[PDB]
Design a protein around this ligand. Structure first.
Ligand code: GPT
Ligand code: GPT
Ligand code: GPT
Ligand code: GPT
Lengths: 212, 233, 204, 196, 198, 222, 222, 196, 198
């Protein structure tokens, strides 16, 4: 698994791979690793599929309930702490989750919180979670600029996942893109890594060590 | 979680054209000690069902009590307890299956393997198995423990699939079962020569036979076997 | 821990009309880390082909061993070794290490130069021989390969047809295995000639 | 397993069940646990079938070479060879062996060699898992200098009880009679000994 | 583990190796050179178990220098890597295996081309454009996969390595105290004494 | 010590067609190297045009199916006999499974039916409730033997247009129920050849706007 | 695995199934479990395949050499003594479980050997996971003074009991008859009751379907 | 431990050795393993001394309350109370108990309750580590409807054998006779039973 | 573990805490502030188990702010440290103990003196001139034992800390990504935004 999220001038980019494996068995090449909490909030899933899917969907329900109660959009800080505190109640039971809670509110602006099953909750600008994380970090760390264009930012995120999909045996299948704006997130497609790799290799000139 | 102490071995059964047959020896083992010999492991319930039990004997006795209570209870405020509202073999099984799975789910199982044999009110044959794990299944022939390995192959040579049921008579069927009981006495080190057998026929009803014995055994050829290879005398 | 799941890789051999094919992926990894996309698992001594899956260090060692043995064989016999004979050599060489085996899954493919008969065989890590008439699979995606072969395969396929079959079996099996892929090569073998083709596949 | 050896007036008789198991499965129901190591020196085997066979085969070999050089070996000498093998290799063997032989000067003799490799000369001996159940019975019913018929009866009744309570014992009861008259093989079937 | 990186450019091979030697709770040295010259045009870097590491390196060094004197010739990089792979392949099945991973960077004066070989303690050998041992590859391969070009100059290679080391210094939990870099080409082996800020 | 789990073998297959869907499974039930039954249905019609199978540990599989059927029953009771849509059933099953997150139903479950647009649908679940809507999914023992085949013959993976130099992918024309049934049968006969836990019989349940239909085929018994 | 031996009036017959497995996967659907030690001494093997084969060939080699040295026909008791002492020495690490039979100058013989080195004698025997299904048949139909034809039938049925009821056994039945005064007759695939039905479809691909990157001729001639 | 209960013509007799060990040490050599739960319903205890004492004490309590409300309990009822306690608490108990009582309508009765908590009504029963050695002897020498003198002899000979082979059994042999005539306590010393 | 240092000078208490947050193989953050203000003149630093760390800190923060509102008064540093010690002493014998170590630095406005308290997860509390949790003390205590003086100025304290951090950066195997420093005195709590090169 490789998932990433980063903050920039245009909001937030969220990119994930779509592979599921149990040992050496590729269970699927088309899994969703992004949960649309609600029209304004996205969550990434790394670790346990069931744990992330279940609690991130439940988070959505808590967020909605908050908005009905307070007649106001929930903050990313508050949304992420609901998940964090829930997960913390289960500490030691065996939950397995590495996640990013992403939103863009008027009050906070673009915000990303890393939340895991250890009970860790970190606010940050860039995060990568999964067995492919180190690969994505290399690409992200050397090309990231706060002043990136929504177009370039989207490409950077897609490229970083591609890097990981290539080197990490547990990452691959396709890439799913998202752009988070204050008015909500925008889906930016599903890109099969198979086709994406060759295209990027040619157009970019990278992956020279691979015969094409 | 526990561990079986006094145990009963195989329970074999099969269905023929008009009913089902089920048998089980009368032994209650204690490890390698063949401790008790007057143990009845076939439990008749009413006159259309027989429950054969293998595994822990203390748990079997417990199941016995559960079964007697079912009968008592079913009779309560039931003017049709001996007619339209009498216990069906399928009700008895569903009940036991429920208990077995609940007990394994609480990590405190009834250490048994059970076969419920009987005839439904509409005449249909009923044969289904349930064990300590709550696992259940049906087949023209059913056997637990050792009998699963040695009896099923023999009984299946008679009824290999559904269509063979209507072609099988009580005589043929009872013969198979009796032969299987003898085989088990030859190769199962926890078996007994004495056993009980029960027939549940949609016409003749429930026939329960006690004190049967394995007969017609071949041992003479043993005199011809000496040494373990090169020895001549 | 499991020596046969450290580096990854697969190999598959098939028989066809007066021909045989043997194929393999090109991956060499370190658990989840891909390391090389040019690690071929097919070798040949004269007209006999040997594919080896499993622990890479042993794949390399075994190849060097059999090159060494078939070279001496040729110098004494004054003829190149045949598929049938080589299979016996592979078998006894593996059993010789019965209690400290090479962690590999060899596969032999070739045509007997005198009878023209197509030949393929598989081995377990201690030499047990499997002489199949249809196909032989080996590697971290051998289950997937069995599924692919048992369906896609049919007798007496012509070289050009067997090529498509062997390739589709290899490729689709590899894409369901995290430790296989990163390229693939297929060998089409006939009495007179042998063609080697590199396939295009996903690189993730 | 249930095996025993009993000395009597005219010599000695060896007896045993015929069951070999692998768990609760009866791998062989007509096993011959009475093995010849010399014309009038036999043994009863219990424990590992592989180990006792290997031991016996070696003893037979040793006594054959002994005979070629120094004539017929004494039963005591045979028990010493078994002992040597069982004691010196105690860490890797699981063998409970009873040695019984007929000598003209010594008549019948019985030596039991249990797990550790120790040797014990006795009027009679029982061994095997089934023997635990007949210690009381045998201790009450054994008498020295019994007749052939009496001894065959003692052994038949004892083993039938061992076979009755022990699931590791069963099949037929085999006996070997060793006297000056020679070697006699006896066998008793279930139908007979079960109703004793 | 330590940092062991290798990059083969157009006319040379560059090896970068961490300088720290840590033992438990303390960093004992910060100028350690984890390399041995096997022959004028062949360099070997290494990482692994505390004592095995140098003992193995020097043992190989001794054997290659002995071959050089006996034959008055310099074995090709490919030949040297095969010798090393076989030593490690014997070692893995011996009583106490050498727990050492290596990178062999050499300039083949006959072919006039640089060569990089990666071999682990099991005797697993592979020839690559660039390689690493340990966790090093996890942080740097995505960068190399991207910027690598077969016609790179030594200078471009050094810049690409610098980028890798910077990624390593940002994301890796351990302080490996920088790296020592060495270049191997047609003129031999030389050390880039200025990488502490190149 | 007591082990609350067992493995009854078996393999199941779910394929969604444009306006239909199938859920197949062999009928062999096992324990170790013994056959418990050559015919023990494993795919069930749960009402509301939904078929389901929970393969793996049979006791857990039965409990789940039984629990879900009872769930459909109460759905009707509590919501004026409203029909339970395939997507709602899926979400429901997720909760049934996740409710035992710390003492899981040791099964791989799959349901098939038609979505609210009449299109064929399949959902496959994790032993602990993770789920995804999919085109086709094999579950159980031979799953690893079947999926590769399906990727190739259903989604035409790795297949290109002859002469295009692998530059043009083979077009994804979609299959009919007849063509799908063939792939299912070939999948199982192939699985039956290489997996000792697959065999005896193949029972398929077909779902269309007209309801649920069943087909049965024998499989090798060795 | 199911292997059996059955003595008849003038000889002995052994049979075996042809399934070979790696875990739950059938690695070979038609392996041969019947090995020749010498022309008239054949062996049926169960357990670790490489071991049954290797041990059978080792003793067979030494038996041939012994035969040449003594100018006599090999005796079954010799193969038995050599096999058991070899297996005993390895304390069960050589997973060979064999049924050795044959005719020699002293008559016809039937024995079994277990991995640890213990041997047994009988008129009928069987080893392997299918052992129990087979033995049930043998304990039910065996009788003394069987004819060559009756023996072949009994042995053959005993193997089938395994193919059908044991997941560890399957495919075909191999037989070998060794009669006192004739040549031993090896009947490879005496029974083949598990032929795969014709597939529902042909998966032959149109040429060009596979994408190719590079192509080249391989040099075999030195 | 060696304990047994035997029904005969006039009722039933319970017997037992008097040894309690803690390893190879004899903690008590004059133990009374025959415990009264009611006037004519006693039990033989084996296994844990602490567990069997606690069980017995509770049974006695239950039967005392039973008597106050419904009169004298049947032996079957006493065995049911023991059973309930032993089965429902099988995970935390180590108790092998034989229940024996005299009824006027039923005469003597014996119920054995082994480790699992199962119940078995028998003509006679033996239990305890020492019992393994007398299965054969007892099976051969037991007869139904024996006289008081014969039964006392059967039990004395059986237990003397159990005591002889079992290191966990020893001391004196205690017996309790239950008949319409009442309750009688018997004791036999080593010097007497050892030379039987 | 992380770096948690404390030094009590003449009129203030200074707390230095590492900025790195590492999870396995990657450093996820390099600007983490391992501190919580409990009251205007009381600061608490902390290190330990991943989630327990912050959950505990905030729980204490909540309780002290609640006390402040209810009583409209600020508990003395001694009182706050006693409350914290008792919470940890209960926790150690609970089902799942808080694995958190802390330093409480506060300025007692009544006594007009700075105070430093060190308390581990077992509830072991001690008052010191300077302290640390983890391995930090092993490298820095010899320096503090030497240069420490009760009349030191805040400025001298910062210089002494700087020396400690430099020793930590030289000898410690992990890259803790520098420290964030905070001063607590009669005027409250303030952060030294300039220690990246002071
Ligand atoms: C990635 O984290 C993994 C994915 O399978 C799951 C599946 C769906 C969404 C959450 C992430 N998780 C894993 O356990 C697996 C192997 C890790 F070694 C994965 C492919 O990396
Ligand atoms: C008896 O000792 C046993 C016999 O199988 C062997 C077989 C042949 C002659 C020597 C004795 N040995 C056993 O291990 C077995 C089970 C014991 F629990 C046996 C039946 O008792
Ligand atoms: C039978 O014994 C087994 C066979 O695979 C081998 C193969 C060839 C001839 C020798 C026997 N052995 C096994 O280990 C395997 C599974 C056992 F559970 C087998 C099918 O039963
Ligand atoms: C007999 O079972 C034992 C007796 O000590 C107790 C004591 C009093 C009455 C109940 C039985 N129980 C033992 O544990 C002990 C050692 C067994 F190895 C005993 C002597 O056999």
């Amino acid at each position: 698994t490789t998932t990433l999220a980063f903050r920039f001038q245009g909001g937030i980019i969220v990119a994930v791979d779509s592979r599921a494996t149990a040992g050496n068995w590729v269970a699927s090449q088309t899994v969703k690793k992004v949960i649309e909490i609600n029209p304004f909030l996205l969550g990434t899933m790394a670790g346990g599929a069931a744990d992330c899917q279940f609690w991130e969907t439940w988070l959505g329900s808590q967020c909605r309930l908050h908005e009905l109660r307070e007649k106001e959009r929930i903050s990313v800080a508050a949304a992420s702490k609901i998940l964090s505190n829930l997960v913390y109640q289960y500490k030691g039971a065996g939950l397995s989750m590495g996640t990013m809670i992403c939103g863009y509110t008027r009050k906070e602006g673009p915000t990303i919180y890393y939340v895991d099953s250890d009970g860790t909750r970190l606010k940050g600008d860039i995060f990568c979670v999964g067995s492919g994380q180190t690969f994505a970090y290399g690409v992200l760390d050397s090309n990231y600029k706060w002043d990136l264009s929504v177009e370039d930012a989207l490409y950077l995120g897609k490229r970083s996942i591609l890097a990981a999909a290539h080197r990490d045996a547990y990452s691959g299948g396709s890439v799913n893109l998202y752009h988070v704006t204050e008015d909500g997130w925008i889906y930016h497609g599903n890109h099969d890594v198979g086709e994406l790799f060759w295209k990027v290799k040619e157009e970019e000139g990278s992956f020279n060590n691979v015969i094409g | 979680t526990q561990q079986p102490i006094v145990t009963g071995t195989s329970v074999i059964s099969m269905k023929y054209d008009n009913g089902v047959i089920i048998a089980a020896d009368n032994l209650g083992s204690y490890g390698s000690l063949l401790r008790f010999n007057g143990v009845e492991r076939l439990i008749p319930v009413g006159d259309n069902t027989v429950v054969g039990i293998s595994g822990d004997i203390s748990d079997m006795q417990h199941i016995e009590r559960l079964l007697k209570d079912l009968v008592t209870e079913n009779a309560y405020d039931n003017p049709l307890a001996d007619a339209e509202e009498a216990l069906e073999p399928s009700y008895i099984f569903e009940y036991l299956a429920t208990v077995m799975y609940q007990r394994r789910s609480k990590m405190n199982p009834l250490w048994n393997a059970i076969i419920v044999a009987g005839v439904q009110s509409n005449g249909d044959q009923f044969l289904r198995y349930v064990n300590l794990l709550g696992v259940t299944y049906s087949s023209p022939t059913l056997a637990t423990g050792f009998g699963a390995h040695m009896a099923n192959p023999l009984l299946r040579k008679v009824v290999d699939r559904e269509s063979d049921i209507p072609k099988t008579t009580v005589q043929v069927a009872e013969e198979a079962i009796v032969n299987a009981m003898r085989v088990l006495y030859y190769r199962d080190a926890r078996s007994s020569r004495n056993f009980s057998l029960a027939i549940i026929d949609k016409n003749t009803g429930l026939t329960f036979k006690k004190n049967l014995q394995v007969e017609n055994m071949k041992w003479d050829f043993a005199k011809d076997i000496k040494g373990y290879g090169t020895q001549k005398i | 821990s499991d020596p046969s799941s450290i580096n990854g890789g697969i190999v598959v051999a098939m028989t066809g009309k007066d021909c045989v094919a043997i194929a393999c992926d090109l991956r060499l990894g370190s658990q989840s880390l891909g390391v090389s996309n040019k690690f071929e698992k097919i070798f040949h001594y004269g007209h006999v082909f040997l594919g080896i899956t499993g622990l890479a260090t042993d794949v390399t060692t075994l190849n060097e061993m059999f090159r060494y043995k078939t070279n001496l064989y040729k110098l004494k016999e004054e003829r190149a070794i045949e598929p049938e004979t080589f299979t016996q050599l592979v078998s006894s060489s593996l059993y010789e290490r019965r209690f400290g085996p090479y962690f590999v899954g060899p596969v032999v493919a070739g045509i007997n130069s005198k009878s023209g008969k197509p030949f393929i065989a598989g081995f377990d890590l201690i030499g047990c021989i499997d002489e199949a008439k249809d196909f032989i699979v080996s590697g971290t995606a051998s289950d997937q390969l069995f599924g692919m072969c048992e369906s896609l395969y049919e007798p007496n396929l012509e070289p050009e047809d067997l090529f498509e079959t062997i390739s589709q079996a290899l490729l689709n099996a590899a894409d369901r295995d995290a430790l296989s892929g990163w390229g693939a090569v297929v060998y089409i073998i006939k009495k007179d000639e042998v063609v080697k083709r590199y396939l295009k596949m996903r690189q993730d | 397993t249930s095996i025993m050896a009993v000395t009597f007036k005219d010599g000695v008789i060896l007896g045993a069940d015929s069951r070999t198991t692998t768990g609760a499965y009866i791998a062989n129901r007509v096993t011959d646990k009475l093995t010849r190591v010399h014309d009038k020196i036999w043994c009863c085997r219990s424990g590992s079938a592989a180990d006792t066979q290997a031991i016996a085969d070696i003893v037979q070999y040793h006594l054959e070479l002994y005979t070629s050089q120094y004539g017929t070996p004494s039963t005591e000498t045979a028990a010493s060879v078994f002992k040597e093998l069982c004691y010196e290799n105690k860490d890797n063997l699981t063998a409970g062996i009873i040695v019984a032989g007929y000598d003209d000067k010594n008549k019948g003799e019985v030596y039991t060699i249990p797990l550790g490799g120790s040797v014990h000369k006795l009027p009679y001996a029982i061994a095997g898992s089934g023997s635990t159940f007949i210690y009381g019975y045998c201790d009450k019913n054994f008498r020295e200098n019994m007749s052939k018929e009496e001894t065959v009866d003692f052994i038949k009744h004892s083993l039938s009880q061992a076979i009755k309570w022990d699931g590791s014992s069963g099949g037929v009861i085999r006996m070997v009679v060793l006297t000056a008259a020679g070697v006699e093989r006896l066998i008793f079937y279930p139908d007979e000994y079960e109703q004793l | 583990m330590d940092i062991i990186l290798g990059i083969r450019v157009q006319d040379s091979v560059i090896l970068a190796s961490s300088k720290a030697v840590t033992r438990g709770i303390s960093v004992l040295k910060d100028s350690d050179d984890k390399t041995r010259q096997l022959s004028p045009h062949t360099l070997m870097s290494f990482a692994g178990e505390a004592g095995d590491t140098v003992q193995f390196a020097e043992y190989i060094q001794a054997n290659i220098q002995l071959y050089s004197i006996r034959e008055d010739y310099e074995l090709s990089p490919q030949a040297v890597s095969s010798f090393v792979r076989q030593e490690l392949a014997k070692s893995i099945r011996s009583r106490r295996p050498y727990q050492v991973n290596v990178l062999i960077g050499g300039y083949d004066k006959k072919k006039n081309k640089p060569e990089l070989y990666q071999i682990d303690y099991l005797g697993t050998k592979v020839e690559l454009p660039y390689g690493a041992h340990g966790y090093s590859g996890f942080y740097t391969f995505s960068l190399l996969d991207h910027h690598y070009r077969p016609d790179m100059t030594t200078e471009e290679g050094l810049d690409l390595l610098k980028l890798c080391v910077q990624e390593l210094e940002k994301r890796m939990p351990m302080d490996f105290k920088g790296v020592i870099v060495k270049i191997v080409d047609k003129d031999g082996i030389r050390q880039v004494d200025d990488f502490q800020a190149q | 010590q007591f082990n609350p789990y067992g493995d009854n073998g078996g393999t199941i297959l779910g394929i969604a067609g444009e306006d239909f869907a199938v859920l197949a499974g062999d009928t062999r039930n096992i324990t170790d190297y013994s056959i418990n039954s050559r015919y023990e249905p494993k795919v069930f019609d749960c009402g509301d045009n939904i078929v389901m199978s929970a393969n793996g540990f049979a006791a857990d599989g039965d409990a789940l199916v039984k629990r879900f059927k009872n769930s459909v029953k109460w759905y009707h009771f509590d919501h004026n006999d409203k029909k339970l849509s395939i997507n709602s059933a899926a979400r429901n099953i997720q909760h049934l499974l996740y409710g035992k997150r710390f003492f899981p139903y040791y099964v791989h479950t799959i349901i098939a039916g038609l979505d609210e647009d009449g299109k064929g649908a399949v959902y496959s679940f994790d032993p602990v409730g993770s789920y995804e809507r999919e085109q086709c999914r094999a579950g159980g023992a031979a799953a690893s033997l079947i999926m590769p085949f399906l990727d190739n013959q259903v989604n035409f993976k790795n297949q290109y247009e002859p002469g295009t130099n692998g530059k043009v992918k083979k077009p994804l024309k979609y299959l009919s129920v007849e063509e799908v049934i063939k792939l299912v049968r070939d999948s199982f006969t192939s699985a039956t050849e290489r997996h000792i836990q697959v065999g005896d019989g193949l029972e398929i349940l077909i779902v269309t706007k007209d309801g649920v239909r069943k087909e049965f085929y024998e499989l090798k018994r060795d | 695995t199911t292997i059996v031996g059955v003595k008849f009036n003038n000889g002995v017959v052994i049979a075996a199934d042809t399934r070979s497995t790696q875990g739950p996967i059938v690695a070979d659907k038609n392996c041969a479990k019947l090995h020749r030690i010498s022309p008239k001494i054949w062996c049926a093997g169960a357990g670790t395949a490489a071991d049954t084969e290797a041990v059978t060939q080792l003793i067979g080699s030494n038996i041939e050499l012994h035969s040449l040295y003594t100018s006599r026909e090999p005796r079954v008791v010799s193969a038995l003594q050599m096999l058991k002492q070899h297996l005993f020495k390895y304390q069960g690490h050589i997973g060979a479980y064999l049924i050795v039979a044959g005719v020699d100058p002293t008559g016809s013989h039937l024995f079994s050997i277990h991995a640890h080195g213990s041997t047994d004698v009988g008129y009928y025997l069987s080893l392997g996971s299918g052992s129990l299904a087979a033995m049930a048949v043998l304990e039910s139909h065996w009788k003394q003074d069987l004819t060559k034809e009756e023996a072949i039938k009994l042995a053959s049925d005993a193997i089938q009991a395994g193919i059908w009821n044991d997941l560890g056994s399957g495919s075909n039945v191999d037989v070998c008859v060794m009669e006192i005064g004739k040549d031993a007759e090896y009947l490879r695939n005496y029974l083949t009751p598990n032929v795969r039905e014709e597939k529902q479809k042909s998966y032959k691909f149109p040429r060009g379907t596979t994408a190719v990157l590079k192509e080249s001729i391989v040099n075999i001639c030195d």
